[PDB]
Amino acid sequence: SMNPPPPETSNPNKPKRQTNQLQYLLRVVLKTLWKHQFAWPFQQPVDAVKLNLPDYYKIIKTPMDMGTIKKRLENNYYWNAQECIQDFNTMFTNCYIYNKPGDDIVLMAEALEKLFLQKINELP
């Protein structure tokens, strides 16, 4: 059960813009979630081979992680702030999909999602 390549993070042909919303998403949202005690399973793509999770990429067809989001923000990959917010939401929902209600990893993702929402509440 091979891992897929990680999501694309840079496209020099995509037009680029700097907005207050995108700057906040990197400098506040991504930065704060990265430093959360429970962030470490979400800082890079799920390595289903190393973790012995052969069904991970049979269930999760839209993988996402904070390492990918960080790169997308740095590379001006997002034009709309909603694209970034959607990626964070895909990351949390993937965890809820693969796992089950009450699992430790689900409770960790729920705590990160609650911090995300406290930070997004304050978006420009």
Ligand SMILES: COc1ccc(-c2ccc3nnc(C)n3n2)cc1OC
């Ligand atoms: C670096 O180490 C790890 C990295 C990730 C996981 C892990 C396991 C199941 C799962 N379901 N959704 C997500 C996200 N994950 N992440 C576990 C790790 O070590 C035990």
